[PDB]
Design a protein around this motif. Structure first.
Motif, PDB file in Angstrom:
ATOM      1  N   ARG A 225       0.733  -1.186   0.013  1.00  0.00           N
ATOM      2  CA  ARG A 225       0.004  -0.053  -0.111  1.00  0.00           C
ATOM      3  C   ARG A 225       0.814   1.198   0.081  1.00  0.00           C
ATOM      4  N   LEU A 226       1.834   1.283   0.613  1.00  0.00           N
ATOM      5  CA  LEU A 226       2.817   2.402   0.776  1.00  0.00           C
ATOM      6  C   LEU A 226       3.493   2.677  -0.688  1.00  0.00           C
ATOM      7  N   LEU A 227       3.869   1.740  -1.387  1.00  0.00           N
ATOM      8  CA  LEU A 227       4.416   1.683  -2.789  1.00  0.00           C
ATOM      9  C   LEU A 227       3.062   2.208  -3.630  1.00  0.00           C
ATOM     10  N   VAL A 228       1.825   1.754  -3.452  1.00  0.00           N
ATOM     11  CA  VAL A 228       0.886   2.098  -4.166  1.00  0.00           C
ATOM     12  C   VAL A 228       0.638   3.827  -4.073  1.00  0.00           C
ATOM     13  N   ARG A 229       0.605   4.134  -2.815  1.00  0.00           N
ATOM     14  CA  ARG A 229       0.677   5.139  -2.544  1.00  0.00           C
ATOM     15  C   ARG A 229       1.831   6.379  -2.969  1.00  0.00           C
ATOM     16  N   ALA A 230       2.959   5.762  -3.005  1.00  0.00           N
ATOM     17  CA  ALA A 230       4.082   6.635  -3.502  1.00  0.00           C
ATOM     18  C   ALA A 230       4.133   6.719  -5.219  1.00  0.00           C
ATOM     19  N   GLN A 231       3.457   5.709  -5.660  1.00  0.00           N
ATOM     20  CA  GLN A 231       3.437   5.897  -7.269  1.00  0.00           C
ATOM     21  C   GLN A 231       2.017   6.707  -7.539  1.00  0.00           C
ATOM     22  N   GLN A 232       1.225   6.799  -6.566  1.00  0.00           N
ATOM     23  CA  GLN A 232       0.099   7.876  -6.930  1.00  0.00           C
ATOM     24  C   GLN A 232       0.697   9.214  -7.018  1.00  0.00           C
ATOM     25  N   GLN A 233       1.652   9.501  -6.334  1.00  0.00           N
ATOM     26  CA  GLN A 233       2.346  10.764  -6.392  1.00  0.00           C
ATOM     27  C   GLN A 233       3.503  10.663  -7.618  1.00  0.00           C
ATOM     28  N   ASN A 234       4.153  11.825  -7.966  1.00  0.00           N
ATOM     29  CA  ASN A 234       5.076  11.816  -9.043  1.00  0.00           C
ATOM     30  C   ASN A 234       6.310  11.049  -8.458  1.00  0.00           C
ATOM     31  N   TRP A 235       6.717  11.118  -7.361  1.00  0.00           N
ATOM     32  CA  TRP A 235       7.969  10.400  -6.886  1.00  0.00           C
ATOM     33  C   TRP A 235       7.474   9.107  -6.321  1.00  0.00           C
ATOM     34  N   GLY A 236       7.967   8.210  -7.002  1.00  0.00           N
ATOM     35  CA  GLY A 236       7.943   6.786  -6.374  1.00  0.00           C
ATOM     36  C   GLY A 236       9.235   6.048  -6.758  1.00  0.00           C
ATOM     37  N   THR A 237       9.076   4.683  -6.323  1.00  0.00           N
ATOM     38  CA  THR A 237      10.083   3.710  -6.474  1.00  0.00           C
ATOM     39  C   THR A 237      11.253   4.029  -5.617  1.00  0.00           C
ATOM     40  N   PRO A 238      11.294   3.984  -4.416  1.00  0.00           N
ATOM     41  CA  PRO A 238      12.501   4.334  -3.579  1.00  0.00           C
ATOM     42  C   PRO A 238      13.510   2.855  -3.569  1.00  0.00           C
ATOM     43  N   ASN A 239      14.636   3.349  -3.013  1.00  0.00           N
ATOM     44  CA  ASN A 239      15.387   1.878  -2.611  1.00  0.00           C
ATOM     45  C   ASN A 239      14.767   1.316  -1.403  1.00  0.00           C
ATOM     46  N   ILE A 240      13.970   1.867  -0.601  1.00  0.00           N
ATOM     47  CA  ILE A 240      13.609   1.077   0.598  1.00  0.00           C
ATOM     48  C   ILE A 240      12.506   0.039   0.115  1.00  0.00           C
ATOM     49  N   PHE A 241      11.837   0.413  -0.896  1.00  0.00           N
ATOM     50  CA  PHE A 241      10.864  -0.766  -1.471  1.00  0.00           C
ATOM     51  C   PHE A 241      11.681  -1.808  -1.899  1.00  0.00           C
ATOM     52  N   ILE A 242      12.732  -1.498  -2.766  1.00  0.00           N
ATOM     53  CA  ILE A 242      13.526  -2.702  -3.197  1.00  0.00           C
ATOM     54  C   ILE A 242      14.073  -3.418  -2.127  1.00  0.00           C
ATOM     55  N   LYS A 243      14.786  -2.791  -1.045  1.00  0.00           N
ATOM     56  CA  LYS A 243      15.239  -3.817   0.031  1.00  0.00           C
ATOM     57  C   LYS A 243      14.275  -4.256   0.727  1.00  0.00           C
TER      58      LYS A 243
END
Ligand SMILES: [Mg+2]
Ligand SMILES: [Mg+2]
Ligand SMILES: [Mg+2]
Ligand SMILES: [Mg+2]
Ligand SMILES: [Mg+2]
Ligand SMILES: [Mg+2]
Ligand SMILES: [Mg+2]
Ligand SMILES: [Mg+2]
Ligand SMILES: [Mg+2]
Ligand SMILES: [Mg+2]
Ligand SMILES: [Mg+2]
Ligand SMILES: [Mg+2]
Ligand SMILES: [Mg+2]
Ligand SMILES: [Mg+2]
Ligand SMILES: [Mg+2]
Ligand SMILES: [Mg+2]
Ligand SMILES: [Mg+2]
Ligand SMILES: [Mg+2]
Ligand SMILES: [Mg+2]
Ligand SMILES: [Mg+2]
Ligand SMILES: [Mg+2]
Ligand SMILES: [Mg+2]
Ligand SMILES: [Mg+2]
Ligand SMILES: [Zn+2]
Lengths: 151, 129, 81, 144, 153, 25, 93
Positions: G35-53
């Motif tokens: 859900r955090l990834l979906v919310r970040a992708q909703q805004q312009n800035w998404g796909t941080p390294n923390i999600f991949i980790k």
RNA sequence: AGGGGAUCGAAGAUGAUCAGAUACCGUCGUAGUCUUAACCAUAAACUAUGCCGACUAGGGAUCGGGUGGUGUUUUUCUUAUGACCCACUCGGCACCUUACGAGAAAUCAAAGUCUUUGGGUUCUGGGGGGAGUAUGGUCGCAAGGCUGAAACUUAAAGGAAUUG
RNA sequence: GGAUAGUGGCCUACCAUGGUUUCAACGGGUAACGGGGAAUAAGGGUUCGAUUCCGGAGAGGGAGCCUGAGAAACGGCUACCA
């Protein structure tokens, strides 16, 4: 007189004539015209530039009425059509220029608004071109492929 | 944008008849509008109308006669069974003596009386009286 | 103006109306046979030419573009097509 | 114009739009939420039986100067206490203390009526026999 | 996909026997049946090597009853397809229509090629799984827009 | 009252109620 | 917009701690990370390294060998497979 | 939070009026007012008129653009400009008169082409309070925002104009 | 493969990671049994349908079962709970 993202209602456009054949005064033949088109395309111009040049410096009213075919079709048949449709390329160039300007100075909000408008235009046009399958269906535009394409 | 070309046409003809003109210029022309005009002309609500070619979209110049009082399009081209057409002609047309529900059947674009006589029914286009 | 012939109205009226609004759309611009002072070459130029059209043989500015109708050079002489 | 969708394939939006706007009518909201059951003193019921707790003379509204003799009654169906009016002249003295009294609606869709404040229901029967028969001496109270 | 009885038990069409003592060894005798209703068996079924006891052509299941046309919306399951059927439900209260859709999971024989976007004709069969009640019969637009991918005159 | 003042009084009452709720929790 | 990245990093640390002991709350952590990834992708800035980790940590936790914990294991395996559709794993390697 | 710190200035300090005046007026005066990053997302954010289309009536002006003028001055001897004058055209803020239509009108050239009821579309309202309250979610550091009842009560509340 | 009268994740062993959803899945409520229909009535609808017909379910609440073609029966059993 509708506008895509503005309140304007402009009527400015090109007003193609009623005649479907060549004008009575045109002396050159269509083969020379198409050869000229191909040499200009080899020079590296967009079809709109081809049309404006052949309208100005020569007697070609519009290339279709005399050559029997449209400029983009002419370039495609001889294999000079760009992999990206030209108007979408101009949109991408405008978008990357605005991205660069926003990068240099951040507080400018009006450029950001116009940038999101440009992104909307690009999304719409690219969706259409995907529908007609001019672009590969995988074609997608986010940030840096723009800087790859414009260069 | 301009969604229903025939709606534009009939709005123009109605406005100009109310204004008092004897001729109208329907700006975009289409086959369905032409058939509508043929029906009204055959029944006499219109005088002598003329088509103009433009290589983009035809224009129509309709010479009225003032006999027409009001046309109108039923813009959602509803589906009408052979039974509901009586309900529609009761809803739209003032009296059963005259007035015609112009509708499109598989046999063509045609009024409701001819449609009843051919025993066919389709989608409703408009109403003229 | 309850009765008038929209099919064949008076020519001055159509010439008066804006383009894209006459009975049939027909542009008002035209082409011109222009003669350069230098040589005897005759070149065809659009009325509202957008680029600085030059003689193919010699670099001379036959037309200077502007907002609307292109402006011809002083020495060049034009003839309506 | 008429800013509701009108195309053929817009049945869904029109249907949901009507279902949503139907929540504006008070009657429809009352019916669907079942307010006549959960919170109304009567369980969506015309009449109910109860027991008189004591008798009260409620003063009327502004232009009317009088006292309207009502009785507080505890309903036997659920136990909610509520006041209730008693019609006609000599009827309060006909209502015995702690007596089986049947109450009905007061004629204004469950709203207070006339110059009587906060009282919402009549009295039709007391101790089995009706009040109107007692008032006209058609019958005598069972005084049980 | 060249599985050929990779699973734990052997994959044999029941009660079709090949005699090894018969000194012909012309592959193995394959059972197939024309399914009827004017549907032609694909050459992949006759000349193929799969097993698919649930194949309408080279299996035991039979086709009768409904004949539904639809569009595949998910090929990702094994040996089976999720078909999306769209239709217009008529609402009489407004004389209008709603676009509605139902998901029908059917079973696809390895004899066919199905990819997302194809339009397929499917037929009713006996209960195959909890939700599979259909076996594909025909795939029309397998590469309708996919035949042409490059462009150079 | 002015509707403005009614809103402001209600906001102050909400502030007091939230303070009481924070004290209780 | 650094709060989203900080929360994602805290979730990744919690996932690593849970895997140290494993899917009891790791399933909920991965679900909230989705859900955090979906919310970040909703805004312009998404796909941080923390999600991949966090995705890599969840994949490691599910991969390890291991009662509602079995539902957690199945759901975490499915979630790791779904979030592993991204090619960012190549970046992690 | 960090940089500013002139004026102005909520709170306050006061000096007067007043029956009372921590209000109007007069002096000062922190926070803010100005900035740099991060929040907040509300205003009578009003034209109290959603957007996109077509049509319906005349009048000048005004702004930008484009057309023509054997036009007027300019002046660089004169062309070419530019600035103006005349006519037209496209688009925009508006304005004036009028209704032939509209409205309950006040008024509107859109609020018209709506019982002769249908060009395409989103979003709202269904008597006034209770109340934008309670509760529940969600956003927010907080202020608060978004979403949002009911019990109960009431016979009106309200719009426009008319005469006093 | 088992089981069934039989199809079937109906169940088991192993394997794949799928199934549905803003065209409203899922969840919550229903003073909801469903339908044939009833009241109402310009046309369109609104509400109701426990109730003479057709289906479904139950015999205090759940479960298990003998018998026989047909029952998870209940004016048949066995057991727990009230
Ligand atoms: Mg059309
Ligand atoms: Mg009194
Ligand atoms: Mg500071
Ligand atoms: Mg003070
Ligand atoms: Mg003082
Ligand atoms: Mg001061
Ligand atoms: Mg607001
Ligand atoms: Mg507003
Ligand atoms: Mg607005
Ligand atoms: Mg109300
Ligand atoms: Mg309020
Ligand atoms: Mg709350
Ligand atoms: Mg008001
Ligand atoms: Mg008033
Ligand atoms: Mg089996
Ligand atoms: Mg019902
Ligand atoms: Mg029933
Ligand atoms: Mg039974
Ligand atoms: Mg009993
Ligand atoms: Mg027997
Ligand atoms: Mg039993
Ligand atoms: Mg029995
Ligand atoms: Mg017994
Ligand atoms: Zn030259």
């Amino acid at each position: 007189m509708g506008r895509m993202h503005s309140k304007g209602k402009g009527m400015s456009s090109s007003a193609i004539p009623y005649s479907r054949n060549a004008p009575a005064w045109f002396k050159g033949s269509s083969d020379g015209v198409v050869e000229q088109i191909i040499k200009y395309a080899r020079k590296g111009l967009t079809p709109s530039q081809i049309g404006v040049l052949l309208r100005d410096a020569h007697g070609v009213t519009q290339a279709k009425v005399i050559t029997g075919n449209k400029i983009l079709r002419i370039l495609k048949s001889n294999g000079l059509a760009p992999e990206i449709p030209e108007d979408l390329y101009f949109l991408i160039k405008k978008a990357v220029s605005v991205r660069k300007h926003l990068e240099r100075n951040r507080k400018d909000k009006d450029a950001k608004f116009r940038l999101i408008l440009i992104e909307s235009r690009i999304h719409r046009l690219a969706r259409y071109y995907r529908t007609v399958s001019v672009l590969p269906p995988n074609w997608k535009y986010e940030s840096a492929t723009a800087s790859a394409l414009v260069n | 944008t301009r969604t229903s070309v025939l709606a534009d046409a009939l709005n123009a003809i109605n406005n100009a008849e109310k204004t008092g003109k004897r001729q109208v210029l329907i700006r975009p022309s289409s086959k369905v509008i032409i058939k509508f005009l043929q029906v009204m002309q055959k029944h006499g609500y219109i005088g002598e109308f003329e088509y103009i070619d433009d290589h983009r979209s035809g224009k129509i110049v309709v010479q009225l006669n003032g006999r027409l009082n009001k046309c109108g399009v039923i813009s959602p081209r509803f589906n009408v069974k052979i039974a509901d057409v009586e309900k529609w002609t009761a809803n739209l047309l003032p009296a059963r003596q005259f007035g015609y529900v112009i509708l499109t059947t598989s046999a063509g674009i045609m009024d409701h009386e001819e449609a009843h006589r051919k025993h066919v029914s389709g989608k409703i286009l408009g109403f003229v009286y | 103006v309850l009765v008038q012939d929209l099919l064949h109205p008076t020519a001055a009226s159509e010439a008066r109306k804006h383009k894209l609004k006459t009975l049939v759309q027909s542009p008002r611009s035209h082409f011109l046979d222009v003669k350069c002072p230098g040589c005897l070459n005759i070149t065809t130029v659009f009325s509202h030419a957008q680029t600085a059209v030059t003689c193919e043989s010699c670099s001379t500015v036959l037309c200077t573009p502007t907002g609307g109708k292109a402006k011809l050079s002083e020495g060049t002489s034009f003839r309506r097509k | 114009g008429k800013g509701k969708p009108r195309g053929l394939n817009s049945a869904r939006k029109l249907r949901v739009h009507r279902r949503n706007n139907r929540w504006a009518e008070t009657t429809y909201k009352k019916r669907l939420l079942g307010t006549a059951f959960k919170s109304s003193p009567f369980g969506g019921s015309s009449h109910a039986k109860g027991i008189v707790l004591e008798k009260i003379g409620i003063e009327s509204k502004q232009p009317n100067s009088a006292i309207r003799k009502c009785v507080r009654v505890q309903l036997i169906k659920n136990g909610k206490k509520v006041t209730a009016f008693v019609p006609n002249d000599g009827c309060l003295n006909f209502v015995d203390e702690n007596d089986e009294v049947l109450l009905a609606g007061f004629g204004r869709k469950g709203k207070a009526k006339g110059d009587i404040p906060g009282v919402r229901f009549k009295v039709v029967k007391v101790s089995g026999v009706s009040l109107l028969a007692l008032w006209k001496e058609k019958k005598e109270k069972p005084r049980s | 996909e060249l599985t050929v009885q990779s699973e734990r038990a052997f994959q044999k069409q029941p009660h079709i026997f090949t005699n090894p003592k018969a000194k012909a060894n012309r592959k193995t005798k394959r059972w197939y049946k024309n399914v009827g209703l004017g549907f032609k068996t694909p050459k992949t079924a006759i000349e193929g090597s799969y097993i698919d006891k649930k194949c309408p052509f080279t299996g035991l299941v039979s086709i009768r009853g409904k004949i539904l046309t639809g569009t595949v919306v998910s090929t990702r399951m094994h040996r089976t397809i999720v078909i999306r059927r769209d239709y217009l439900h008529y609402v009489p209260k407004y004389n209008r229509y709603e676009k509605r859709h139902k998901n029908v999971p059917a079973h696809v024989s390895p004899a066919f090629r199905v990819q997302v976007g194809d339009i397929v004709t499917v037929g009713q069969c006996r209960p195959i799984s909890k939700t599979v009640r259909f076996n594909v019969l025909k795939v029309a637009s397998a590469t309708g827009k996919a035949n042409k991918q490059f462009a150079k005159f | 009252m002015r509707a403005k003042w009614r809103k402001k009084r209600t906001r102050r009452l909400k502030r007091k109620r939230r303070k009481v709720r924070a004290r209780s929790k | 917009k650094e709060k989203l990245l900080d929360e994602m990093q805290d979730v990744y640390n919690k996932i690593s701690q849970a895997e140290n002991s494993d899917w009891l709350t790791i399933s909920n952590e991965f679900d909230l990370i989705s859900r955090l990834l979906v919310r970040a992708q909703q805004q312009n800035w998404g796909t941080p390294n923390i999600f991949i980790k966090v995705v890599a940590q969840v994949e490691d936790a599910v991969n390890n060998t291991q009662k509602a914990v079995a539902r957690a294991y199945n759901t975490t395996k499915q979630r790791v497979k779904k979030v592993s559709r991204e090619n960012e794993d190549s970046m992690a390697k």
